């Protein structure tokens, strides 16, 4: 199960369409069990489970629909209708799927995640991502400055523009922030339902966690 | 009334072809009589309205849809995607059947059979109906 | 306490008792020594979401939009140097020729070469120096 936790740290986040809201979920599945972390962007919830709990809980939820634990796990790896309740702070996540031509049930018994995993799975990665993204901004801004030194050499000896629509204004970073903060930040920083996060950041998430 | 003979292999008995005969009044759902035989011995039992309901209702499926599964399992109504599995102790006379997908078998139902006391006789009746059913569809063929 | 902390953000010490953090201040007020203890519980999941997770996520998205807007800026400067060399019938001192920008390769070089230090959490130090003006803006928004 230690390897299940290690896989989990380095899994990306998926996005789940409930009827009631959406969730973010990262999951790591093997034949050995699973580990899951879930969030609604206000709270975070954790479960880890081995094959013992799989065959017991599946025999409860699916009374006579028998399998080895690993075949259930294999199907969850495919990943259906999602519903949930917070009962106390069990985010019980109730997952209806179709497997073998039969309706199937799993319930995730997700407790409030520990502050330590919230740090390791979100805050530290998300921080590390913001610093890394800022170094990318810094390297695109050096690259933009380098292309201006190049283009200003043309402007300083002959070299008129032909296509009257290719002009760039000289790149300056403070003013590129100024315009972004008014025109782009409202939309771009919006959390929404977490679909923006899962759509464009998962590569950096995977890289920063593995760093 | 309808009946339907279907030829099967028990998991217990790879090389013996068995015959499953089902007999009922158009809805299988109303309950049915069921015979198994191997050309030497025969077994029988019965299933009822509330037993099919309870079997479906524990499995949490619409009755009629579960009856679909029953037709496909018991009346040869299987597609190429459907793989059914048939199990019987003659010793306990416990029948059960399963469907296979996601690389495992899944019980669909179970029967109390009783070994039948007059084996060669219900076999006689069965092969009479089959010889009739050849001749009838053969007569329809010649006409067509 | 305010005038003590504002320049710094005297001596301090930090002690944990179960879940709770105590922050201790030794300083001076009216020539006399002054003593304080801050008594902090674990912050609630509400606060951690509002002060950390959500804004940090909103910053990463906005920064990803910055990278996108700077990449379209970079490509628009590449059409411009092309229009000088390819048809604007001229050259340069050569010592300043940039490579054509492609964000796939920009990211792969970045993530082999620069990521190991770039995402360093460290002492949280560089986050408070590089990222705060974005943090205040994202939180307002």
Q: Which helix (H) or strand (E) holds A141?
A: helix A124-155
Report the alpha-carbon distance of residue B95 to residue B116 in Å, rounded. 14
CB contact under 8 A, B102 and A71: yes
Question: Is A148 close to C77, i.e. CB distance below 8 A?
Answer: yes
Is residue C10 helix, strand or coil? coil
8 Å CB contact of A102 and B103: no
- Whether A144 and chain C come into contact, CB under 8 Å, resolves to yes
Per-residue b/e over A63-99, b at no fewer than 16 CB within 10 Å?
eebebebbbbbbbbeeeeebebeeeeebbebebebeb
Q: Decide if B83 touches A, using CB distance below 8 A.
A: no
Angle at A49 between CA A48 and CA A55, to 5 degrees: 165
Angle at A63 between CA A57 and CA A65, to 5 degrees: 95
Q: Using what technique was this structure determined?
A: cryo-EM
**Contact by Cβ (8 Å): A134, C130:** yes
Taking an 8 Å cut-off on Cβ atoms, the answer to whether B106 and A74 are in contact is no
Of residues C72, C56, C58, C42, the one with CA closest to residue C127: C56
Confirm if A69 and A86 have CB atoms less than 8 A apart. Answer: no
Chains B and C touch (3+ CB pairs under 8 A): no
CA A77 to chain B, closest CA, distance in angstroms equals: 12
Distance from CA of C77 to the nearest CA of A (A): 6
Q: What end-to-end distance do the CA atoms of chain A give, in Å?
A: 22
With CA atoms as reference, the chain B residue closest to A76 would be B102
| Backbone angles phi and psi of C45, in degrees to 5 | -55, -25
Resolution in angstroms for this experimental structure? 4.4
Interface mutation vs chain A, best among C41, C55, C77, most A CBs within 10 Å:
C77
Measured in residues, chain A has a length of 211
Give the H or E element holding residue C77: helix C54-82
Q: Which backbone phi and psi does A106 adopt, to 5 degrees?
A: -125, 140
Q: Neighbours of B (≥3 Cβ pairs closer than 8 A)?
A: A
Q: Do residues B12 and B6 make contact, with C-beta atoms less than 8 angstroms apart?
A: no
Q: Measured between alpha carbons, how far is C5 from C126 in angstroms, rounded to an integer?
A: 19
| Contact exists between C and A (3 or more beta carbon pairs < 8 Å) | yes
Question: A-chain residues within 8 Å CB-CB of C61?
Answer: 188-190, 196-197, 200-201
Q: Choose among A188, A128, A198, A131: nearest CA to C61.
A: A188
Task: Report CB contact under 8 Å: C53, A118.
Answer: yes
Q: Hey, is the C-beta of B107 within 8 angstroms of any chain A C-beta?
A: yes
Q: At CA B57, angle to CA B55 and CA B60, rounded to 5?
A: 115
Subunit contact A211:C119, Cβ cutoff 8 A: yes
Q: Is C83 helix (H, G, I), strand (E, B) or coil?
A: helix
Sheet of C20-29: strand order equals: C11-17, C20-29, C32-40
Q: Which of A205, A14, A43 is nearest to A128 (CA)?
A: A205
Chain C: residue whose CA lies nearest to A163: C83
- Both tokens of A200, joined, read 């464009």
Paired residues of B36 in beta bridges = B20, B43
Q: What is the DSSP letter of B61?
A: -
Mutate to test the interface with A, among C57, C99, C132, C138 (most CBs of A within 10 A): C57
**Contact with chain A for residue C119, Cβ under 8 A:** yes
Burial of A178 (0-12, 13-18, 19+ CB in 10 A): exposed
Phi–psi pair at A199, nearest 5 degrees: -70, -40
């Amino acid at each position: 199960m230690e390897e299940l936790e290690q896989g989990l740290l380095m899994q990306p986040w998926a996005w789940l369409q409930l009827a009631e809201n959406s969730l973010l979920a990262k999951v790591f599945i093997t034949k050995q069990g699973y580990a899951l972390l879930v969030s609604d962007l206000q709270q975070v919830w954790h479960e880890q489970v081995d094959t013992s709990v799989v065959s017991q809980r599946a025999k409860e939820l699916n009374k006579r629909l028998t399998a080895p634990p690993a075949a259930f796990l294999c199907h969850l790896d495919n990943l259906a209708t999602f519903s949930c309740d917070c009962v106390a702070d069990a985010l019980i996540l109730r997952v209806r799927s179709e497997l073998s031509g039969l309706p199937f049930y799993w319930n995730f018994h997700c407790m409030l995640a520990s502050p330590s995993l919230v740090s390791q799975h979100l805050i530290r990665p998300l921080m590390g991502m913001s610093l890394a993204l800022q170094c990318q901004v810094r390297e695109l801004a050096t690259l933009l400055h380098m292309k201006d030194l190049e283009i200003q050499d043309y402007q300083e000896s002959g070299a008129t523009l032909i296509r009257d629509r290719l002009k760039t204004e000289p790149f300056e970073e403070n003013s590129f922030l100024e315009q972004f903060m008014i025109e782009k930040l409202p939309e771009a920083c919006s959390i929404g339902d977490g679909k923006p996060f899962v759509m464009n950041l998962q590569d950096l998430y995977m890289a920063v966690t593995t760093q | 009334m309808e009946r339907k003979i279907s030829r099967i292999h028990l998991v217990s008995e790879p090389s013996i072809t068995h015959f499953l005969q089902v007999s009922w009044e158009k809805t299988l759902e109303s309950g049915f009589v069921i015979t198994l035989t191997d050309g030497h011995s025969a077994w029988t039992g019965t299933v009822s309205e509330s037993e099919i309901s309870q079997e479906a209702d524990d499995m949490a499926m619409e009755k009629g849809k579960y009856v679909g599964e029953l037709r496909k399992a018991l009346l040869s109504g299987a597609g190429p995607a459907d793989v059914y599995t048939f199990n019987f102790s003659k010793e306990s006379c416990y029948f059960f059947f399963e469907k296979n997908l996601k690389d495992v078998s899944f019980r669909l139902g179970s029967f109390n059979l009783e070994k039948v006391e007059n084996p060669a006789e219900v076999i006689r009746e069965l092969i009479c109906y089959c010889l009739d059913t050849i001749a009838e569809n053969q007569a329809k063929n010649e006409h067509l | 306490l305010d005038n003590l902390l504002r320049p710094l953000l005297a001596t301090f010490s930090c002690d944990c008792v179960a879940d709770a953090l105590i922050l201790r201040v030794r300083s001076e007020l009216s020539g006399l020594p002054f003593y304080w203890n801050f008594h902090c519980m674990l912050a609630s999941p509400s606060l951690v979401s509002q002060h950390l997770i959500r804004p940090l996520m909103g910053m990463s998205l906005a920064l990803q939009c910055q990278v996108r807007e700077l990449a379209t800026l970079l490509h628009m400067k590449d059409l411009e140097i092309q229009d000088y060399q390819e048809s604007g019938a001229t050259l340069i001192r050569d010592r300043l020729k940039t490579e054509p920008f492609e964000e796939n390769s920009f990211l792969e070089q970045f993530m082999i070469e620069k990521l190991p230090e770039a995402c360093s959490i460290g002492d949280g130090k560089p986050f408070v120096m590089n990222l705060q003006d974005l943090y205040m803006a994202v939180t307002t928004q």
